[model samples]
Target chain A: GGVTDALSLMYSTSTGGPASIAANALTDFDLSGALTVNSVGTGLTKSAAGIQLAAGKSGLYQITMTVKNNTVTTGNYLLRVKYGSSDFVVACPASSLTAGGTISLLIYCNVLGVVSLDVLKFSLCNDGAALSNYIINITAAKIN
Target chain B: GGVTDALSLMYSTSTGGPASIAANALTDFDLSGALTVNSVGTGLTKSAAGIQLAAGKSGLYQITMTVKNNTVTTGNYLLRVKYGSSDFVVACPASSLTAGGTISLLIYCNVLGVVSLDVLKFSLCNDGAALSNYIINITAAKIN
Candidate 1:
């Protein structure tokens, strides 16, 4: 037979619009950045070229974390996902100890997409001195 | 010159295999479960085959909740998403007031292949929990 085909899938675009048919796919991001929480509890650093959300991707997202050292990696870790520079106040969990900490928070956020823990601001915190014994895997993907 | 055929879609099988082009189409589950986290904080109980991510259906999912009973009901809430007997630990935000409780977790699990949350074995918690009095929508889909 001759080559005949049709796409049975869905996807969103750079802009936004309604699909003429039954089709729509949300983006799935499983990005992980590795770094030490510096014992102080804050992300490393950042600029402005990219990495933040694109408005549509900037809204509500699914967040997940994986602490490599667990308790073996002592100290407390506070994780914050910011939007812009100073868009939202409270961190996702707002405050906590990253080493197996119990966190819970839900809300429509603002602009600063950087995770800030205490003085770290967009960095992970270990509450004490620098310890390279552990790694924090913080990941998020746009949902709303 | 005026007749056209409608394109149909076929779904994956429960046993896992090739898709048998259906005259029409249907996704065996392409689905999970939806239940309200009653006034007890924890969830209701479960029988065997309820909402375990199925085998091939495990992946990153969009978990959302539009809690209703919230604070008006009064009580801390922890919502857990279970993958069969093995539950996810970490409580995520850990502890939440349920309503007025602000929290949500977008996770990539690794059962059928997914996230690294609280794992699917910890029992003290259901990988998560919601407070009493609320409408929790535990929705999940395969997004690799």
Candidate 2:
């Protein structure tokens, strides 16, 4: 009596400012199979983009990313994954990710006792400077 | 989400000897619902015929018998129950049973994780001698 919930995403980053980036300037995003991106942000160029994940069997997951963007300044950014019904910060202190670089993260779900999904979001900011063009790739798999 | 394991029987026992003419000859016995005694002893008689249990349930059961003639002797005996494919032994020690004597036992299955109809088989033996005319009553309920 068990079911599987599998999903993934693949994208390329560009040197064109936030506006040129696919996930830039987004308010909310919905992920569709294979490759799909939704935006909720407006103006000011590329902000962040990602999809929401539905709650399923609770277990550990390995999240990997491969980013590429040479024209933009290199710096530390934050990668965040949040969950909840109302608009509230779920996972915070966002994971430290380098711009124009790839990184892998490990996250765990303690209990999968509800019918809800967690939101996966990402953002790039200059370490004390202005935000620049940055690209990132993300993928996840459930462990046990 | 958490997974559940199947239930199993752990123990069983009985008391009294094989066949005899005295009033006391039947041994007491108990069993986990996971195990069932299909048939009773040949000589000594049982107060109740057998017991019925529900899936995912457990309870205490009793068995009593009386000596019909003087040919019978009081001796320790053993009983067993089988569930699905697993078997457990219920102990019944040899002891003096008078004419019209009665023996009662308390058998219990803490958790009843199984659901279905099963036949319980009961066998009685003293030292190396098999008893006869014994009666067994099994009682059980669904506790899940």
Candidate 3:
């Protein structure tokens, strides 16, 4: 199918530079613990203890998060992606052991089909012991 | 390198309407335990306790996952991103001796073989013993 008159999004700005004549916003957050989600949502006016999409922005977004883990009990750390006042459970991986790396993901905003507001935010949750050796490097960009 | 139009796909209309002219289709799944991978395929279908590109949809994609660890027995909880039916040995980090942190990774799917379908998923074989309280936030987007 051919693309309509809508301004579609192309590749990500992860590697090289701009590949398409469109608007792609990329934010890098250096968050910490007592547990903190880095401020990578500059384009999406951020807040405390969580994340949300900003005004005038809507679509599917690709999210990548980088952090460190140790040999302590991280309790239950959860990935954050609060819809524009919405709720969708993000899967929580195995905790407590070792082995760490950069994790990325995708999400939708404007078309939840539920008619929710057009805003999304990012944050974290520490159940018992928040994972340590945490990194603040996080990248979120819309691919649609 | 420029993208080959012969292998290009226009915006998606999977949901109900045309939200945006886009090539990225982001899906988040809350998988089950013992490691039961959930199916959030807008373009991919995951089974066999794993994930892979479905039907005729083939190209390159970006994958990300978030996980936590306790101090029980991580054995060696690995952050895996195996390529094409082939085993390249995904990288394991050195961040935790006990507590595991948020691990993220980037993999170029569809490039592993001439037409080999990229199978992506999360798994943790206890070197000691596996811990519960898993956080299952995951995301994947095609970028070709």
Candidate 4:
């Protein structure tokens, strides 16, 4: 079947502090459909909560990262997405993240056969330690 | 840390005529665990808009249901779980439901090391007669 004009995408982050950070850009995709990391970044971060992404497609995606030190005290963090500028929040909450540690997020968009545009954003709330050296990963596809 | 006892529990019900069909239960389990069936046999039927569950453990869980009838009013139903309560509700929506079925849900609780729950519910409204004789089955364990 032809690709649903509607696409759903998600982004995630690792644990180390009580926050999540992720960046996304339309430029990442080349004319040939290959993805290339772009220097121009429009990412989201949360100091005390989870990061949220807009809804589009339904598939599997990952957000991997490594923490360098525990001195960054923040302990909990999550990644999220919502349906509208002001709707419900969706996210993944991290337990106790440490420096030099790694965490992965598996995001699933459970909608099908529809083209919808939800809003994307991030939030940080808890207090602990600062986080450094963070990385984010996102991958998505349509399912039959 | 030692096991902690439940603080409190309650159950109540409402009938169409609103005369006397309410109930509740409360108890304490210390040496031996105690189970209470609140609003049992009374058969409470109403239009459900949505349902969600949080997984306390990460992995895949199976959901099964045994209903008295196979023909149900048309509507949407969804079954999903996530790292936590917040994430579970966010990743899964009410639109991804299958119709005309008994109670049987096979759900995948992804994201290892993350605490999640197994949820089995439906998004049903504006249907024929109230639904009764429905049982939900949930069996969950960690997956390697």
Candidate 5:
């Protein structure tokens, strides 16, 4: 196998980043290259729909993401990466979603074959308050 | 670049695992291959001293470890990976060290250059309760 390119992506670069979502809602991260940063290697591709791994590419990956809870509600939230129907929790029982606070998530996973990283999602699981300008950034590296 | 081997190691096998650890103490995992399993790829080496990566080999790695808290104390513990003076916390505010419970840690990290995974350590941070027969298993995969 050869060295594959790593990933570095951003949701948006406007003054406020991505739009807000209601509390207790789960939403997919838009990595469709519709925003600002979207860089990947030969093993993966980015598109308006999302990102995809090459066919037959299978191995472990180092995935990490950073999110800023732009809401003032001190609620609980969790970051997840879904491949097909499997959802891997990047962080469990996330820190209090205090206003202006940031949360970082990291996970190591093994992929069986072709997969997509576009299913990156997060859920504000406990409160009824909405979030505005929730910023998100993600990256993944393939293991050769 | 060529595919690098992954890592799998065991602390001990006989009924229990490695020696018991005192409360609030930090210790390196013994991957000397003296116990049951010690496997790695060309990028890494293992011996009685510990595990080290080849010089100039640097990128990202996916590290995961499972440990069973065998003691009957309900204290807080944290898993950490240290390279030189930098310590990366795998998990923060770990779950209560309930007896017979298991804790798993996962981390995706970037390496600047050569480093040692043997510096993997854990601290039972908030309690003065010793842990005996604590079982541990660890694995690491290199991300190209």
Candidate 6:
């Protein structure tokens, strides 16, 4: 497929919404489990717990994810975009309650193959405070 | 056309590039003003100071912007994605001199139509410092 023919996918938190993460623990902000998805592109299979690349769907992909900390707690939030059991991109952003703290994790990588397009967050704090009321939004575009 | 046929636009800071923004004030980090654009898909008008949707192009759009504070100052940098005289997404990230201070602002919203797709920034600090030697990048994809 050409550039115009590349597939794309978008999903966000709905209904039960806003996944949470525990402090100092690595947690999966599962897209298929916690949030909802109704994507129309064909390069990926949207299963109940995983988003896998379809056959011959390997190429460069630009994945953008926005994470907002709705709580007033302050700390560094470490984010990782994992696919096929390997971490692709890692972003760490500190949150402040002053300006509605939100972090956007963007990655442009060549996806060789995929079993899962997973997002995980690690709260680098010792306050034993879990990240609650957090919003996660994602957009994936295949750029061939 | 449905979601598969939606338009996509991507622009970055190229030659004569890496647009610099001033501090403690609102400034337009114009995409077409300093950076170069070579788009493939359509349905949006790209001009020198604005990026506007074309006729019948009002729909949901996913805009992802990444701004890197290349300078060595520590302060809170504000970001806004403005279109049609309104600011759609407002993101503020504090730059730490330790980690690579890059702020990514991502927004997904229904674009009601037309006017400027402008990006502005304000440095929220008391120091008389300008956000020089900055790098701002953006990617806009119509989700329909």
Which candidate gets the maximum DockQ versus the true structure?
6
lDDT of 5: 0.47
DockQ of each: 0.11, 0.01, 0.08, 0.04, 0.09, 0.20
Residue B53 C-alpha lDDT in model 1: 36
- The TM-score measured for candidate 2 stands at 0.30
Ranking by DockQ: 6, 1, 5, 3, 4, 2
Stretches of candidate 6 exceeding 4 Å from the true structure: A1-19, A33-38, A96-128, B1-50, B58-72, B76-109, B114-129, B132-144
Off by over 4 Å in 2: A1-5, A12-49, A83-99, A110-117, A128-134, B1-144
Q: Write the per-residue lDDT of candidate 5 for residues B30-77, one digit (tens) a residue.
A: 566434364556665544434466655554555555556644445444
* Model 4 per-residue lDDT tens digits across residues A21-45: 2321111111112122321122222
lDDT (Cα, tens digit) per residue for candidate 2, span A1-144:
221333445443232224443322222322232242322222001213343444444443334444444444333222223323211111111134423433333333333443333444443332223333345455554423
Report the first chain's TM-score for all candidates: 0.39, 0.48, 0.45, 0.31, 0.65, 0.61
lDDT of each: 0.28, 0.32, 0.37, 0.24, 0.47, 0.43
What DockQ class does candidate 6 belong to?
A: incorrect
Q: After superposition, how far is residue A100 of candidate 2 from its true place, in Å?
A: 1.9
Model 3: number of clashes?
A: 44
**Candidate 2 local lDDT, B1-144, one digit each (tens):** 211211111122232222331232323233333233223222111222223333434443332211221123334344444434544553332222111111222334433443332333343334434444443223222111
| Best candidate according to TM-score | 6
Better of 4 and 6 by DockQ: 6
The fraction of reference A/B contacts recovered in model 2 reads 0.00
RMSD of each: 17.4, 26.8, 13.9, 17.8, 7.5, 7.0
Instruction: Report residue B37 deviation for candidate 4 (angstroms).
Output: 32
The regions of model 5 sitting more than 4 angstroms off are A2-27, A30-40, A43-77, A83-144, B1-3, B12-36, B46-51, B73-77, B82-129
Q: Which stretches of candidate 3 lie over 4 Å from their true place?
A: A1-43, A47-51, A55-60, A64-138, B1-42, B69-76, B85-103, B111-118
Docking quality band of candidate 1, CAPRI definitions: incorrect
